[model samples]
Target: AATMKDVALKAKVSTATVSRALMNPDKVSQATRNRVEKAAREVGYLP
Candidate 1:
């Protein structure tokens, strides 16, 4: 899968939510923001 795909996997959130979090993470909140780290950083979703 692609980078975004992997984040979506670990993120376990909708693509929109994932994108929103990645784009800024202000509205995503810790709920999804926390997971964004694990998914984006941990998973290395560099895309």
Candidate 2:
């Protein structure tokens, strides 16, 4: 199972960044948001 930290590290960003990217991507950079989305897809994160 993966945690928020796992997603953050895999995406090369911070937990807060991951959260923002997932919940409010408009507030973050495209690269960061994309990475977060990719990580989430790889890990199959649930809402």
Candidate 3:
């Protein structure tokens, strides 16, 4: 299964960043949010 660490590694960011992005994309930069979203999509995570 895809985990937070997997998303972070795929996005080249920290796990906290992934969590924050997922929990609150508005709080993170657009670039970061995009990366996180891409990773989540690649990993097959649903909203």
Candidate 4:
């Protein structure tokens, strides 16, 4: 049961950053995007 907060925390980033990373991958750095994506996968987030 991972929330957006959980994903953000796991990614060592802010929730807003996480949202942007998901909403628009081009806006964030590749490293940040990768980190967020990995965190989301680890937490099993559907979106």
Off by over 4 Å in 3: 9-12, 21-23
Q: After superposition, which runs of candidate 1 have C-alpha atoms over 4 Å from their true positions? A: 21-24
lDDT of 1 at 18: 61
Best by TM-score: 2
The residue pairs in collision within model 4 are none
Query: Candidate 1, which ten residues in sequence have the lowest lDDT sum?
Result: 38-47
Candidates' TM-scores? Answer: 0.49, 0.55, 0.50, 0.54
Q: Tell me, what's the RMSD of every candidate?
A: 2.7, 2.4, 2.7, 2.3
Candidate 2: stretches off by over 4 Å: 21-23
Clashes of 1: 0
Cα-based RMSD of candidate 2:
2.4
**Candidate 2 local lDDT, residue 18:** 63
Task: Supply the global lDDT for candidate 1.
Answer: 0.64
Please report, in order, the local distance difference test score of every candidate based on alpha carbons.
0.64, 0.68, 0.66, 0.67
What's the CA error at residue 47 for candidate 1, in Å?
2.0
Error of 1 at 46 (Å): 2.7
For all candidates, the clash counts are: 0, 0, 0, 0
Q: For candidate 4, give the lDDT of residue 34.
A: 74
